[PDB]
A paper describes a structure:
To explore this, we crystallized a fragment of Bombyx Maelstrom (BmMael) containing the MAEL domain. This reveals an α/β structure composed of an amino-terminal linker helix followed by the MAEL domain. The MAEL domain is composed of a central β-sheet composed of five strands (β1–β5), where β2 is antiparallel to the others. The β-sheet is flanked on one face by three helices (α8–α10) and on the other by two helices (α6 and α7). Despite this overall resemblance between MAEL and DEDD nuclease domains, one striking difference is the presence of a Zn2+ ion in the MAEL structure that bridges the bottom of the β-sheet and the loop connecting α9 and α10, which encompasses η2. The Zn2+ ion is tetrahedrally coordinated by E137 from β2, H293 from η2, and residues C290 and C302 from loops. The fact that the Zn2+ ion was captured from the bacterial culture media, and not added during initial crystallization trials, points to its paramount importance for the structural integrity of the MAEL domain. A closer comparison of the Bombyx MAEL domain with the DEDD nuclease domain in E. coli Pol III reveals that the catalytic residues (D12, E14, D103, and D167) essential for coordinating two Mn2+ ions in the bacterial enzyme are not conserved in the MAEL domain. Intriguingly, an extensive hydrogen bonding network links these inactive residues in the catalytic pocket: N124 from β1 forms hydrogen bonds (dotted black line in figure) with both E137 of the ECHC motif and R306 from α9, while R306 has an additional interaction with D122 from β1. Interestingly, the construct lacking the HMG box (containing only the linker helix plus the MAEL domain) also showed robust affinity for RNA (129.9 ± 18.86 nM).
Piwi-interacting RNAs (piRNAs) guide Piwi argonautes to their transposon targets for silencing. The highly conserved protein Maelstrom is linked to both piRNA biogenesis and effector roles in this pathway. Maelstrom is composed of an amino-terminal High Mobility Group (HMG) box and a predicted carboxy-terminal MAEL domain that is a signature feature of the protein across the animal kingdom. Our studies suggest that the ancient MAEL nuclease domain evolved to function as an RNA-binding module in metazoan Maelstrom.
Residue numbers in the entry: 90 to 280, 289 to 334
Write the structure that this text describes.
Amino acid sequence: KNAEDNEKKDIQNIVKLKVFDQSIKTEDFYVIDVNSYCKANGDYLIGEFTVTQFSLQDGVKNSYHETIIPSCVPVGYMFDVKLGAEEFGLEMPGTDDAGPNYIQILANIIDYLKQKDRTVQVLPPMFTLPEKVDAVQNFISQMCNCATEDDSLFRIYKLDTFFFTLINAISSHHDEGFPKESLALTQLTKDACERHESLDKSNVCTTSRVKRWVFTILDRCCPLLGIPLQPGKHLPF
Ligand SMILES: [Zn+2]
């Protein structure tokens, strides 16, 4: 994990400089979460994901959400597929074979991440809770075969490490922030989409899941910079 120090030095590198050049309130950061039906044949059977864009100043700008109904159930994994569908409110495989547009989806993602007026071939990170890293890297990898494309394009980084570093760099007073990284995971553990809102919960929604993550970090990070937590932007409504 000598390369997970790299992830750590990467996350610091981004954050320190953007506060160092006094632009951190407006920089755009990206969070991702996924739902998996099951984990079939070495790969995760992805059923939903959301990538959402926020800045400290404006809060959540928007998000990119899709529900994925694979054509079919892997053989050997019916119970497993039914369980996740069950947990996550996902529909079962094969509905008109309104099939996974994976060639397209990498490209919608790649369009979503791309920075206005950047002069390098480099996409922002997406940050997710530590548990969801294997799933979300796998998803990314699955798509890169349907286009011969590469993993390396993407950095799939841990959100707690982000919260920790962002807050502690914008902290000023000693009373502010997290002494240990633990507190961040712990705070993101402390605290939708139309279908799920139609399914009452709308609690296992990756749009939901991902949005509650950002609200707590905005919650602790915004006032350190004197930013009103506007509802429907930093707060709900
Ligand atoms: Zn949803």
